[PDB]
Amino acid sequence: PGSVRVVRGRGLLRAVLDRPERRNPIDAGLLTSLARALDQAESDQDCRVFVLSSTGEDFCAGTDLSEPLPDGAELPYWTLLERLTRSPLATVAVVDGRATAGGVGLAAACDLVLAGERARFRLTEVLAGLVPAMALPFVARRTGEQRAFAATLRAEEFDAGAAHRVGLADLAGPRAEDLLPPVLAGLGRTDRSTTAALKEYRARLFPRDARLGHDASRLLIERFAGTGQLLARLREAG
Amino acid sequence: PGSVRVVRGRGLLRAVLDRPERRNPIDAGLLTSLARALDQAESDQDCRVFVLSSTGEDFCAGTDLSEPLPDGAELPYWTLLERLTRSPLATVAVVDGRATAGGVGLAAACDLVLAGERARFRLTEVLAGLVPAMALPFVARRTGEQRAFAATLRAEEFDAGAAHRVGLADLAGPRAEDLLPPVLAGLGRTDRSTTAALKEYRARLFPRDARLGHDASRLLIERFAGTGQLLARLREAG
Amino acid sequence: PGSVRVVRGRGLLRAVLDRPERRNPIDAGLLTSLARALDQAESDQDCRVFVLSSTGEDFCAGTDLSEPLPDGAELPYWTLLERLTRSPLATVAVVDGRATAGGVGLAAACDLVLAGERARFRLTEVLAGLVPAMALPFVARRTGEQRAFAATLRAEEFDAGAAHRVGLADLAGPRAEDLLPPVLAGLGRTDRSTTAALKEYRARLFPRDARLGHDASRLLIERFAGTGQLLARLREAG
Amino acid sequence: GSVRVVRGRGLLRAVLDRPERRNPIDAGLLTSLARALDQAESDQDCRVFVLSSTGEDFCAGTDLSLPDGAELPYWTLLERLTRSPLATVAVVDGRATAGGVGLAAACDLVLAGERARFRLTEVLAGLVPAMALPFVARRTGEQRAFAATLRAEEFDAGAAHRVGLADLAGPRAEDLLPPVLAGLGRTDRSTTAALKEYRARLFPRDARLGHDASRLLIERFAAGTGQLLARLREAG
Amino acid sequence: GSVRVVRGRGLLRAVLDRPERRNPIDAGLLTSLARALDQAESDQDCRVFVLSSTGEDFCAGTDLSLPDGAELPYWTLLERLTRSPLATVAVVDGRATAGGVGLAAACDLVLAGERARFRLTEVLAGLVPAMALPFVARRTGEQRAFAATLRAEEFDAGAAHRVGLADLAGPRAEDLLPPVLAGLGRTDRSTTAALKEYRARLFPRDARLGHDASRLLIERFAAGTGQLLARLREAG
Amino acid sequence: GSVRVVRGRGLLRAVLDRPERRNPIDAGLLTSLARALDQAESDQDCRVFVLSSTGEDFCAGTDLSLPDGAELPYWTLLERLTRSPLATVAVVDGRATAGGVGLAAACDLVLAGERARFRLTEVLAGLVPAMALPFVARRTGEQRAFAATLRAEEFDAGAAHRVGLADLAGPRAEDLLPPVLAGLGRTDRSTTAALKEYRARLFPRDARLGHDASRLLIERFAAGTGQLLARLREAG
Amino acid sequence: DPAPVARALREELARTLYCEPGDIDDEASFNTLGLDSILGVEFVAFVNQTYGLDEKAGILYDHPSLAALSRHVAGRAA
Amino acid sequence: DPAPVARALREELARTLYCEPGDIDDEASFNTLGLDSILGVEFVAFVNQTYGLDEKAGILYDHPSLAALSRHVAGRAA
Amino acid sequence: DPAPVARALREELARTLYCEPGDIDDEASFNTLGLDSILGVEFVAFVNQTYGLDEKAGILYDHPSLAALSRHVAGRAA
Amino acid sequence: DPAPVARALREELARTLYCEPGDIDDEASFNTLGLDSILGVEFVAFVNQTYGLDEKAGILYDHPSLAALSRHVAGRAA
Amino acid sequence: DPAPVARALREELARTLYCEPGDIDDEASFNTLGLDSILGVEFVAFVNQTYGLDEKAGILYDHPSLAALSRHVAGRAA
Amino acid sequence: DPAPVARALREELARTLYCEPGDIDDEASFNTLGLDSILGVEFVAFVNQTYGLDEKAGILYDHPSLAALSRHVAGRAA
Ligand SMILES: *P(=O)(O)OCC(C)(C)[C@@H](O)C(=O)NCCC(=O)NCCS
Ligand SMILES: *P(=O)(O)OCC(C)(C)[C@@H](O)C(=O)NCCC(=O)NCCS
Ligand SMILES: *P(=O)(O)OCC(C)(C)[C@@H](O)C(=O)NCCC(=O)NCCS
Ligand SMILES: *P(=O)(O)OCC(C)(C)[C@@H](O)C(=O)NCCC(=O)NCCS
Ligand SMILES: *P(=O)(O)OCC(C)(C)[C@@H](O)C(=O)NCCC(=O)NCCS
Ligand SMILES: *P(=O)(O)OCC(C)(C)[C@@H](O)C(=O)NCCC(=O)NCCS
Ligand SMILES: [Cl-]
Ligand SMILES: [Cl-]
Ligand SMILES: [Cl-]
Ligand SMILES: [Cl-]
Ligand SMILES: [Cl-]
Ligand SMILES: [Cl-]
Ligand code: NA
Ligand code: NA
Ligand code: NA
């Protein structure tokens, strides 16, 4: 009876996006439910891995088309993507359907991305007059800046193979779920302490400045604030 | 009767390098003519795209082998490449011949690079005892640092396919001009306001420091100031 | 009668790792011997290239499994890798066997990496509860951050072809030694002055902050300081 | 109805012109294509026969909506596309399905665009594509042609290019045609005629294969087939 | 000893079950596989014959530890895997060496996992793999099959996939099997039977080739061979 | 003039040695290569025949500067390179043009360097390369050999490697030779002889093909040809 | 209500795809599980036979998971 | 007669696709021409505003060439 | 009888490989199953602690499947 | 002076390359337009016939565009 | 002591690999030089014949360079 | 006799290409040897300074091997 279904396994917690009839959109409850799953995982000292998986044809469709910002404040979406890069747990995204708009950032912010045959990634934001400012740093840290910016300007779609070729997926196969057991068995050779120190050192060597989450939050809110027309266009094409 | 021929189309201005008999070299007049085309494009509020194309076998041969620098000052070449990354217009380079030395930066600084069968890219600068300091940040933001520095150290030549594989070209085909209609039709799905906010955010997430254009200008001037011998060698091999 | 055998050629000095029976491990004497070879090369004003090559099946096995840190201090390993990126000489790594743990950084810190059929690269550090903090910036400046961090988390092994595909090797062939003559002949078209200005400008455009060598040194020392168990495990699997 | 002819400089083009029916194979199409190839061959200044189509279906194969020694007209036409003194060029910018794959495969050169798809659906209907396979296998090799049949494998432009079913691929098959026509203008009809005659001398099909292939398709169609065809219908 | 049979839904599986001996070819294996294929063919509801193995060796080839018109049982079995009305599927998750390559190659479909290796070692022993080559060459083409023999080339899963020796590759050959079985359930035995019969009609082996191939292997084995086999033994 | 012979350990090398004329085919070259292959075959300790060249042209083909049952010496030589008991190895470090492609293609193994180029120019001159095509098609498959002829396609080392025309590619064909020679020292002449004899048993050319191919080249040369050859001359 | 319908469909899907019912995620798309348009039409004919319905093959597009189909079918059942 | 509509539609498609009206094969699929789903919605909204219609974006799937779309709009408009 | 050992080993291997005991082919190579040299050392240290043995990590090369390892440990343990 | 020469060459180039004269950019390299050495020799023989000249096939290398060739030819014309 | 053994082996290795003795790095791995298991067994039989030893083919694995093998062989020599 | 010139040129080429004079095939193209246009200019300037000549860089295209270059320089020098 929530948008995230939580499953415990051996040294892992799996958060399953569980609204397939709505295409697993991002709203308040999805971001809180995910933040709460991450909290339950991190509070278990024996947990080493957070697994993010989904349901149906839509991994995550992004913000639902079916906000004030205090100084230094960040939208919850930014807070969650940062958490996925900073958590002492290894974060693994399991993608076997459409990651669209904000869904691309949610997958990209995980340490490891697994893509199956039905995986698709596309930032549709420019087609709606938006800059995907909050997702871009999580895509660009995988694809490099040129491919992330050009894929945004052209609303480029990536299948599993193309996602793997540009760095957005680390592993590709017939089914993302079937790439997970070998990733989990490999992660069982290291521990949370090492995984934590490794993610911390990534932030040390490749930092995001302390203002970036605010500025990116502001840019998305400003552009959403003709947007009504372009979103109607996007739904009609959908 | 200039080194740039200007053509207007639907929401675009096309600047054509138009000295093929001289191999479309960079000199003062080419940089001013290009800066003036960009000005005419940006002043038209209905213009969304700046198209950079050329003539003959040489897209652009770089500085002509056929300067004082005040504090904080940048050479015009740097100013133009920055403009191509910061303009509110989408900048598209159409490359169907040799981009050599400074010609590589001029293409690389555009948002999108289209390469045809006859496209070639090569930084010859180290063969003349020069560092291509002003072009390198525009190449490296496409290729990554290792491939840009190694391609400079080895004076590596890229054809259309190789350019595409390393990120220097975004699209490759038999003819760069025939890749342009689909890029223009795709850009017509977004607007200048979105394109502007997207380029601004690229500068926000991947900045060049305010001293870089000066320091890069200085390094090129210092090395050009045995250079006479190495340029004679380069022309004799040409 | 040392761990480095030194050979002079035309505008080059070749440092050969010469302990194959011990798998060319990193210890104090290897780092001093290498630093001293680099000193002899840089002191010869006619020297333009430093060639790093090895013996047997192990290019370099990393720290030998067969340290106090003053403020601002860096471990000698960091000092040597930085020198290989800052030396006015072109630094070429010739890899025809296993580069393991610290051996990967030593190759990666050279300007050009040549990989033969028997080349293998793998950071085993996370399997021993370590972060390879000192090698990572030299790998990441070649592979990009995602592939360097993920290859560390998964202890990914690269053969010559895979190393070449991700940027860790610049050239691949049946034998790294047979790729060297063409690299040397190409480098003979430029000079030390240009090579020096090019490496300096790489540090200018893609800097490491002044604290990074200390912080990376500290992180490795902290984690080495259950490590005994995990190293026994690693040797038993070896 | 089914074919529209357009002449050009040293060429005749036969356009499959029934897109709303997905360009099916029937007696009308096969006869109109045989008559287009006759017209092209009778013009002694003609050198190229271009086969192109309309809409989303290059050719859907047999519309689902044999004396001794005789061959079905489909066999006869595919053999003519391999034996003609004209260079035969297939322009594939949509789905080539079942017998539609053989019609393309039998041309000297196959150009494949972004929307090109090839798939032999025959085994899903309990059939062997006996008449189309020799023209596919002479391009892909026997293993890929027989495994693609058993698995009803679908090829896009890149896959078709990689396995030899397409000689050239790109965003639009039609934009690959002018450089092919430019190239063929360097040679002549007599030289193309002798080259194709020598291919038949070096890679021959025995004289009985047309009858045998035709017979095998007729047997399996005259079988449980009406159901499998309904099923294939309901699946789309 | 050498083969373990497992039935499934419309299939029979023959498992090479002597891993500690590296699954060698002998009279026992060839006879047990012929008898598995007989059982599978006698069940009229059977449609697929699956050949899989154990441990690190798919099949090491002839254990190193002819009337006129007659063929060696190895030839007879390879031909049966190409002619059976059952779809034949090879699941390769280890080293296929010498005659072991022909046993895989002769199945309709070869699935290759991460540990799959193929190598004809015969010329290193002074032999021609005359009996295995037709089943390899019908997949790779004559040039790659004869140059791989001369050079005793080793293929991993990707290389085997690229040259046509494997139809499908992935981390485990066994995990490629369920989608292949799902796909084959769309067709039936009668349709598979006619397809394979038509492959023999289009790509025939002449009637004497079995005897001739068998003879060439026997001649060269009966030659300097005992030494070359020792050497191959000492090399492992 | 045209061939220089160098002996090595178990090998004879025939070097095309007229670089300033681009190593054309004439009666002198064909006879000197037949006589080199005779010498190599007469030495019972010889196992390998190496064909290599000089300058920028591996071989430019027929210098532009038939009783019943008889074959032209070019046919006879290409067949000998496929039938010899010696392993035949082509070292290609420049342009192989027209008949020069067949000379390489007919060797057991083709090594291709960075400057290797292959191109059948024949249709641009109104000719069919009838004598060279079987040796090309046995490597590339019939579709790529006939479409490369119709289009006068040029292959560099990588493209030649991808389509099977080259077995090995790298920066220099000559540096690929020592590992090939090292590998061939593991086998012997008797084993190589039987392998090549079995390739002819499995992939035969009928007895009339040499005459027919020779005849087709003679007919088209004896035709409008003098002009097309001038044109090909002026183009370079 | 739907849980028995879901199990009857899960066993049939398992047999069509040569896996065990316990290998099937009820929320996975039919495209992710590897059900093509052909076995899709057979699967719908199975639904129709077992539940006496007359659903079009298109229903696997409208309810593209075992969970979604089993709810649609149970709600059309007596 | 669909010819007047085909002309009005050909000119809008050429502007949308950055080609000349003369380059457009009326029987080519919109997919072959490179009309994406976004420019498809704009093109149908051009048809609606020009002829006083309100056809769903979906209409380009039903009639997926200029010629087929022209017959639809022709027989509809007046 | 190796069956009790094969069971104890199958359950540890499944936990190590993040599968169910039921998914493991006892005759599959450890390489085919994806047991690397690191998890191999942990697995042999499981065998040693459980049966009071001290077999070298090398033992998985000598007996490279669950079945072969089970016979080794069976005939060794008591 | 050259504009008529440029048009006569543009129409012949259009026919050799199976495009319309209006598709040809006079400033595009002959290599970009797709003119090989073979049709290059035919094109030069066309220039020679039409203008009574005796140019070598190499002239397409010296003046490697329609614009450049048409200026060279017009300046050699009466 | 080993330098003569090293030269006798270096000349034989040069002949097996179709290079000159001066092309061989005594410290290069046998795998880097391109010696396979087959010529490896012939090379060991050469060592045994020349030095009257009875080394197993495995010795090239224990001493995997010319330098290492030549020290092992010289120390087993009279 | 070109042999003295071929020797002087072979030694400069070996130094330029970082090989031994003995490794150079005199009849190999400069392209096959990896002499680029830049080292080509330096090599011709070596020929000019050594023999009192001033041959264009272009000479290596006219005589594109060591042997052909040696005959040219031989018959020219004195
Ligand atoms: P069935 O699996 O034999 O056939 C179904 C189909 C050929 C009609 C089907 O392939 C199709 O045309 N699908 C359109 C679906 C689609 O969007 N493709 C999937 C990639 S996103
Ligand atoms: P538009 O080019 O942005 O595409 C949007 C889309 C919904 C049409 C597309 O992204 C998608 O997911 N489906 C592709 C296949 C299609 O056209 N839809 C199937 C309807 S029958
Ligand atoms: P583990 O998966 O970390 O692998 C360590 C290793 C030593 C086994 C491996 O990295 C290696 O270098 N050898 C691979 C082949 C092997 O298993 N060893 C040969 C012993 S017979
Ligand atoms: P034509 O097109 O049949 O032949 C011309 C040619 C074979 C002489 C020509 O291909 C050639 O040798 N060109 C040298 C030109 C060159 O530099 N290649 C283009 C790549 S930059
Ligand atoms: P020989 O060269 O014919 O055969 C030796 C071998 C087949 C036993 C050998 O290939 C092998 O199995 N080696 C194991 C060695 C290994 O680890 N592979 C090299 C990649 S790291
Ligand atoms: P160098 O290796 O730097 O090359 C310079 C170059 C002018 C020779 C070259 O870059 C180029 O553009 N042409 C390549 C073909 C050639 O050698 N020139 C043709 C003259 S006939
Ligand atoms: Cl965003
Ligand atoms: Cl610059
Ligand atoms: Cl480190
Ligand atoms: Cl058919
Ligand atoms: Cl055999
Ligand atoms: Cl010929
Ligand atoms: Na996979
Ligand atoms: Na393209
Ligand atoms: Na190489």
Automatic annotation (TrEMBL), chains A, B, C:
<feature type="binding site">
    <location>
        <position position="118"/>
    </location>
    <ligand>
        <name>(R)-4'-phosphopantetheine</name>
    </ligand>
</feature>
<feature type="binding site">
    <location>
        <position position="120"/>
    </location>
    <ligand>
        <name>(R)-4'-phosphopantetheine</name>
    </ligand>
</feature>
<dbReference type="InterPro" id="IPR001753">
    <property type="entry name" value="Enoyl-CoA_hydra/iso"/>
</dbReference>
<dbReference type="Pfam" id="PF00378">
    <property type="entry name" value="ECH_1"/>
</dbReference>
<feature type="binding site">
    <location>
        <position position="122"/>
    </location>
    <ligand>
        <name>(R)-4'-phosphopantetheine</name>
    </ligand>
</feature>
<comment type="similarity">
    <text>Belongs to the enoyl-CoA hydratase/isomerase family.</text>
</comment>
<dbReference type="InterPro" id="IPR051683">
    <property type="entry name" value="Enoyl-CoA_Hydratase/Isomerase"/>
</dbReference>
<protein>
    <submittedName>
        <fullName>Enoyl-CoA hydratase</fullName>
    </submittedName>
</protein>
<dbReference type="InterPro" id="IPR029045">
    <property type="entry name" value="ClpP/crotonase-like_dom_sf"/>
</dbReference>
<dbReference type="GO" id="GO:0003824">
    <property type="term" value="F:catalytic activity"/>
</dbReference>
UniProtKB/TrEMBL annotation, chains G, H, I, J, K, L:
<feature type="binding site">
    <location>
        <position position="61"/>
    </location>
    <ligand>
        <name>(R)-4'-phosphopantetheine</name>
    </ligand>
</feature>
<feature type="domain" description="Carrier">
    <location>
        <begin position="1"/>
        <end position="77"/>
    </location>
</feature>
<feature type="binding site">
    <location>
        <position position="37"/>
    </location>
    <ligand>
        <name>(R)-4'-phosphopantetheine</name>
    </ligand>
</feature>
<protein>
    <submittedName>
        <fullName>Hybrid polyketide synthase-non ribosomal peptide synthetase</fullName>
    </submittedName>
</protein>
